[PDB]
Amino acid sequence: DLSQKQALQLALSAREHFWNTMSGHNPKVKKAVCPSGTFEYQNLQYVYMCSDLGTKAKAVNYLTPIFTKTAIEKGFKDYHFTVSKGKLAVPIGDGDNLLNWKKSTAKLISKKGSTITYEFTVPTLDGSPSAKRKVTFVKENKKWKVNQFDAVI
C-alpha cells in the first residue's frame, strides 16, 4: 500500500527533514537559538546544531516520523555528527538543490512484505542529465518510512 504518488510525497518529506537536519535547524521552530562558533575535531570543521536540534534525542525525535531508527543512526555516523560540550554539532557543509525532486517520476524496483523500493528519475534545474535515485521505504511502527537518511537531496 505505497503507491508511486505516495512514495514521492514521502521522499519529499525525507528531503525536507534531511535538509533541515544537515542545515542545523527546523525552520518551523521560531524560538530556536543557533550557537555560534566553530571548532576542529578529527580533521573536520564543525558548527553547532541550533537548539531545536541541539541533542541527539531532539534530532531523533524530529526525524522519527519520516526515517527508520537505523536510518537515523547511520545518518549520524555517515555525516560525522558529534556531541561537544553537550551540544550536537555537524561538520561544515553546503546543500545542493540541483535535483528537482518535485518533478521526478518513479519506477517500481522491488517490494516484499513491508518494504518497497522505487527508482526516481529526477530532472535537474540546469538541464544536465536527469539523475537516478533509489529510495527504499520500510513500514516502521505501522508507518511508511525512508530507510536511508540521505536518499533524497
Binding site: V90, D96, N97, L98, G127, P129
Partner: protein
Amino acid sequence: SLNVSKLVSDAKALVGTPYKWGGTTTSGFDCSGFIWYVLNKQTSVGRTSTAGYWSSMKSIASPSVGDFVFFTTYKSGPSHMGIYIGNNSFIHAGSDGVQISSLNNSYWKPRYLGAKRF
C-alpha cells in the same frame, strides 16, 4: 599565489566524484568541500562553507582561470561555488557529481553573483 595550472588540473581529475553534504573526500564532495580539497593540495586553507569563501577570498571584477565563481541557488546570497576554468566554463561539485558547466547556462547565468580570488 596558487599554481593555477595544478589547481585546474586537480579539479578536472575529480570529474564524476559524487555529491555528499559536507563532503571533503574523493568518496563525496559538496561544492565548498571540493574547493577546499583542491586548494589544500597546495596550501593551507580553512574548510568553510561557500559563504565563508565569499567573505574570505579577494574581490575581483571578473574571473581569470583559477578564480572562483559563486551562485545563489537554494538560498539568497552565495550558496554554490566552482572554479573558473576559462572559456566561460566552471568546474564544481554538484548533487549529481563533479561537473563542468557553462556560465551561459540558462539556469546558472542569472544566478551568477560574482567571482573571488584566493
